[PDB]
């Protein structure tokens, strides 16, 4: 009902960043892309969607 997809993207970006060891960016009209974080997650043995 509230449609906060940005929250899910924040969760995946944070998970991939803490597995990779670097803080991520959720900058408006930009920021860290979802494909890179999915690649980081799948390289660490986790699911691409978190």
């Amino acid at each position: 009902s509230r449609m906060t997809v940005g929250k899910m993207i924040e969760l995946i970006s944070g998970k991939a960043g803490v597995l990779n060891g670097t803080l991520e960016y959720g900058t408006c009209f930009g920021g860290s892309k979802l494909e890179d974080m999915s690649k980081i997650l799948v390289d660490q043995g986790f699911n691409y969607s978190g």
Binding site: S1, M3, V5, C28, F29
Partner: protein, 146 residues
Amino acid sequence: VEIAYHKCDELITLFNKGELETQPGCNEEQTLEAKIGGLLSKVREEVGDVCINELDNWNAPLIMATCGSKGSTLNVSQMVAVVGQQIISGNRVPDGFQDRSLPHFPKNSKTPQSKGFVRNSFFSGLSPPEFLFHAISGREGLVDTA
């Protein structure tokens, strides 16, 4: 969306030239706005319908919409597919500047993307003009509630 945009541009061309047929109770601008709004609502409904029929079972927004516990088909369509036209006080986005909505669009522009149609889903991220138009609609809702 490209088909709808091309048709809307055709209506803009006919309106600018002057051979646009008018509704029985409306003038040229009113019938242009009504036809464009109907076309954009139709394309939003079509994209939403092709979106909902494709989502597989055990999809959590789909389950929560089927139950009626929270959400609806429209919210799922807005998250996964086109958000749709932004409507302020029953009309499209008013001309905040002189004869246009934003300086990022040409003067006397009545294209769907220049007057409050958000192509992008909430998953794909909104462009700055679509972000501003959605902010206008949300602010109208907030003020009305307040």
